[PDB]
Design a protein around this nucleic acid. Structure first.
Length: 125
RNA sequence: GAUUCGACGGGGACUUCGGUCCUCGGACGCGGGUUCGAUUCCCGC
């Protein structure tokens, strides 16, 4: 029914944030990026975060390795396809409780690239 | 093998206007075009 293939998970985040809610992806990717995401290409979530600007949702520091396609800043503010009520929802929480929104993984789901997003807290340790 | 569930942009529908939707574009090097329909066909970079 729903075939999916892992691309990259964020280990540096499973022992740091305590997940409160998870939401599913939607990212307007640039051509090249998709190819170099299939071609295998490296990707990291180091110091990557999500911000809600003009009513939109943005993934801020995701390194997507480029490829021989001839331009494509590997970091780009990438936009997320996520449903207004979902943004507004997330947005609220961030204020109200000071929470934070971070990326948990990248994966394929019907040859559509997607990024899992959570609304998290801190751990105190 | 419709299809980013969604954001945004372009069209459009119903509404006690607060709502509720449809559709088209876009991510498979870059711009097109063929076709009902094209990451896989065609035409330059």
């Amino acid at each position: 029914s729903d075939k999916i293939i892992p691309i990259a998970e964020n280990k540096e985040a499973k022992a740091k944030y305590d997940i409160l809610e998870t939401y599913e992806a939607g990212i307007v990717l640039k051509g090249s990026e998709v190819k170099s995401l299939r071609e295998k290409g490296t990707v990291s979530f180091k110091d990557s975060f999500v911000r809600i600007e003009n009513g939109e949702a943005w993934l801020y520091n995701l390194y997507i390795a480029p490829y021989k396609h001839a331009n494509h800043d590997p970091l780009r503010k990438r936009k997320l396809l996520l449903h207004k009520r979902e943004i507004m929802r997330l947005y609220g929480k961030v204020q109200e409780k000071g929470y934070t929104i971070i990326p948990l993984k990248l994966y394929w789901k019907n040859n559509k690239v997607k990024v899992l997003i959570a609304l998290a807290k801190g751990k105190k340790l």
